[model samples]
Each structure stands twice: as structure tokens, then as C-alpha cells.
Target: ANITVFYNEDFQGKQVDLPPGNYTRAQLAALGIENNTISSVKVPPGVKAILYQNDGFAGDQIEVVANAEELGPLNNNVSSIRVISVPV
Candidate 1:
């Protein structure tokens, strides 16, 4: 399974599928996801993830294991991400 990120709220705008792994801001940018642009996210069932505000997985964080229509503080504030685990 993979985690889905939306650039707009309510699952709108650009979409990106991320497999289970660690990702830095640069990596996200390289993947076409600019910093502070994520608005919503969907963590597939049986998957766990963490969103970070600063690079290197530092600063603020949000744990996700389910779909989020709106990211709130995490909205447009993600700098890094780590897909911790997922079912095979």
C-alpha cells in the first residue's frame, strides 16, 4: 500500500502516491511536491506514517494511519515524511 497526498483540501489538487519509506523535503520537491503545499492526505489501511515540519524529520510532527480530509496544522506545513509500516 501507499500513502496519498493532496495539494488541496478535500483531496483535490495535485496528487502523489508515496510508497513506504523515508522522504525529505528535497525528495518531495524532486517529486514535484513543493514545501508547504500539502493540504490533505490518505494513509492506506494497514499503513502508518509521520509528517514532519522541518527537514531531517525534525520539528513538528503528525502521525497518520487513516484518511484526512483536512490537515489542519499539518496543512501546507509538511517538510518531510516517513512511511513507517504497511501490510504486505
Candidate 2:
């Protein structure tokens, strides 16, 4: 599922909550995101400059691996997370 997050300008240096569920513009507005404006984005997985996949909104379930920080700290923070499908 797709977990869409929005950047809120009014939340400068403020902590934004992105629960593991679906969010909407109206919902964000309630959280002061509509007129608050959006600044930059902060992807938690720390995987920037790479093409992240969009699994789509099946159940709005997008699990950003927790221990992803370890994937970095390498010589150039180089690593890969490949999803291989196997026949069941």
C-alpha cells in the first residue's frame, strides 16, 4: 500500500506524525497542513537520491525498514534492497 506524506511549512522544526495508515488533504488540513504550506520532504528510510518504489494503496501499508540506517555509513553509503519474487 502507498503511504503518502506531506511537508508542512507551518511545522518548522516541529515534529510531524505519519502513522502507518492512509492520509488525505482534508485530514492533513485538520493537522494544519492545507494552508500551512509544505516545505521540503524528509523520507525516514534515509534513502535519498534513489528511485523509491510505490507499491500502491492496497491497505495503505508501507513499511520503511527500521534498521535502514545501517544500510548507509558505508564508504559511500552504498547498498541495495531488492525484492525478488518466488513462485509459491
Candidate 3:
């Protein structure tokens, strides 16, 4: 039902809670997260997040099912997001 995004690695630093939905770059910026600064992410079971590396949901992407402590090369490179709950 919720997703937690961290500004630093290992789920440390500034964190923002988000509900399941699509988030464009502008929306993410309005949420206080700058481009290339989303270091970590945590999602509950049944919740999935798709991280895109380009604005408007175009570019490299990763599927996160639970938690991603470090995105590695994609770290801080996130640009858009789509969160959804697995259907029953």
C-alpha cells in the first residue's frame, strides 16, 4: 500500500512515502527528490515498483519487488516511477 524512498543508500537519509501510482519526473521533483538522488527504495510484499531512468517513463528501467538497498549503476539515476499492487 506504500513505498518508501530514501535519499541515501541502505534506506538511510531523507525518506519519502508514496502510494501506488505513476510518478513523472516533475512529480518526483515536487516530492522533494532531485534527479539522480533516489539512493534506496523499500516496498512491501505484493507491492512492486518500476523505476525508469528517463523522464516521462522512457529509458532504462528496473523492477523492484521488495527492497533495493543499492541500485548500483542505476543508483541516483531514477527519473520516473510506477508503483502497483499485485492483484488478488
Candidate 4:
């Protein structure tokens, strides 16, 4: 199931790239994740993942290639990536 991702702008037709890694539950725990992890890898130039509240579905790792609104310099690493987890 695809979760609804809210952004400052519309990201309906974007292609975000996933990191060159496949993290595991243990790895997340090692990273200090005390609960469930909903990693939202934010790709720049207008791309980011559609995060979720559940981890039971197939991880999309889908790319979001947004419009020109996504094209520009990085006020904060446009192509940088990070993880965001939430407590269950």
C-alpha cells in the first residue's frame, strides 16, 4: 500500500532515487531505532519517497523525479538522503 506523502509542493510525478543500500531491522536497531522505522529517503531536485505508517507492504523504494520546481541548488543537499522512523 502506498502511503500519502505530503510535501511543500506537489510531487505526483517525481522520481526519487534510493540509496545504494538495503537496511535491515537489526541495522535500524543498531542505528538507535527503538521502534518501527519508516525511512523517508529524500532525494533532491524535487524527489522523495512516499513514507508509510506500516511496514508490512512491499517497500517501493520508488523514485520521484519532480518538475522544474525540484531543479536548483541545495539549500540543504538537494540530492542528500536521510532516514525518519516513528514509534509504534
Candidate 5:
């Protein structure tokens, strides 16, 4: 399963699909996604992800087990992320 990061709410706007792994702000920046640019997230069933507000999984984080149209405080505040595969 993969996690989708969106630049806008409701999964609209530029998006980046991430496989199970760890990503840092610099890595995301290489993909043209700046810090605090993620506004939404989508996680497939049986998958989970953590959105971090700082690099190297530091700072605040939000667990995502399903689609998030609006990330609230986490909105546009993702600097890193970690995706995990959950057993069904």
C-alpha cells in the first residue's frame, strides 16, 4: 500500500505517492514539495502513516489510518513522513 500526500484539501492539487519508507524534508523538497505544503493525506486500508512537522520524524506528528481531507493543525505542516504496512 501507498500513502498519498496532497497540496490541497479533499485530495485536490499536486500530490506525491509514497511507498512504505521514511522521508525527510530535503527528500520531499527534491520532489518539489516544500515544508508545510501538505494539506491532506490518503492512506490505503491496512496501511498507516505518520505525518511529521519536522525533519527526521521530530516535532509534532499525526497518525493517519484513513483519508484526511483536512489535516487540521497538521495541515500544510508536514516536513517528514513515515509509512507503515498494517497486517489485516
Candidate 6:
């Protein structure tokens, strides 16, 4: 019931699964997951995720509404993430 992030594309390598919430690079850093290290992302069906190119939710953004084996231009460049709404 959360979103998943992968260190490498194709859902391989280190992974982090998190419940809906807002996370900054610093927050991710706390988990030892540095900025620009996420290669792929997977969100629960019917859920949406926002990936930011820079911190503080600024810069470029990608709306992920489904699982992705690759992040395209956003690959290994995401600095923050936001899950606006979530169920209890």
C-alpha cells in the first residue's frame, strides 16, 4: 500500500517502499538514498506519485500514475517525491 523506488532500472538493485507522504532529498538522505540515485519507481494501482527534479518540489516534475521500469529523463535525477492523497 505504498510506492516503491529502485536504485537501478528494471526494478532491480536497492529498493525502498514507502507509504504515501512527502519526501525531500534530505529525508531520502536519512535513508542513505542520495539524490539523483533513483532509477525507477512503482506506485500502487490507482495511485499517483510526483517526482521532482530538484529539492523543495521545484524544478521539473513527472507525474507517475503507474509502475515504470525506467524513469526516462527523470532517471537517476529525482530529488524529491510527493504523494498528494492516500487512503487510510
- Please write out the lDDT profile of model 4 over residues 5-79, one tens digit for every residue: 222234343223343333344443454432232222234442233322223323423333322233222211222
Give Cα-based local distance difference scores for all models.
0.90, 0.29, 0.89, 0.30, 0.89, 0.86
| Deviation from native of the Cα of residue 49 in model 1, angstroms | 1.2
When 2 and 3 are scored with TM-score, the better candidate is 3
Clashes of each: 0, 0, 1, 9, 1, 0
lDDT per residue (tens digit) for residues 2-88 in model 6: 788999999999998767788999998986778899898888764678999999998998998888999899998999888755452
TM-score, candidate 6, is 0.90
Prediction RMSDs, each to the true structure: 1.3, 12.2, 1.0, 13.3, 1.0, 1.8
Q: Cα lDDT of model 2 overall?
A: 0.29
lDDT of 1 by residue, 1-88 (tens): 8889999998999999998889999999998889989999988787888999998999988998899888888888999999877665
Q: Candidate 6: what lDDT?
A: 0.86
Backbone clash pairs for candidate 1 read none
How much is 6 displaced in model 2, in angstroms? Answer: 7.8
TM-score of each: 0.93, 0.32, 0.93, 0.27, 0.93, 0.90
By TM-score, the better pick of 3 and 4 is 3
Q: Candidate 6: misplaced stretches above 4 Å?
A: 86-88
Better of 4 and 6 by TM-score: 6
lDDT tens readout by residue for model 2, 1-88: 1112234232233334443333344554465544223332334442322212222222212233321221111212112111222222
TM-score of model number 1? 0.93
Give the lowest summed-lDDT range of ten residues in model 2: 72-81
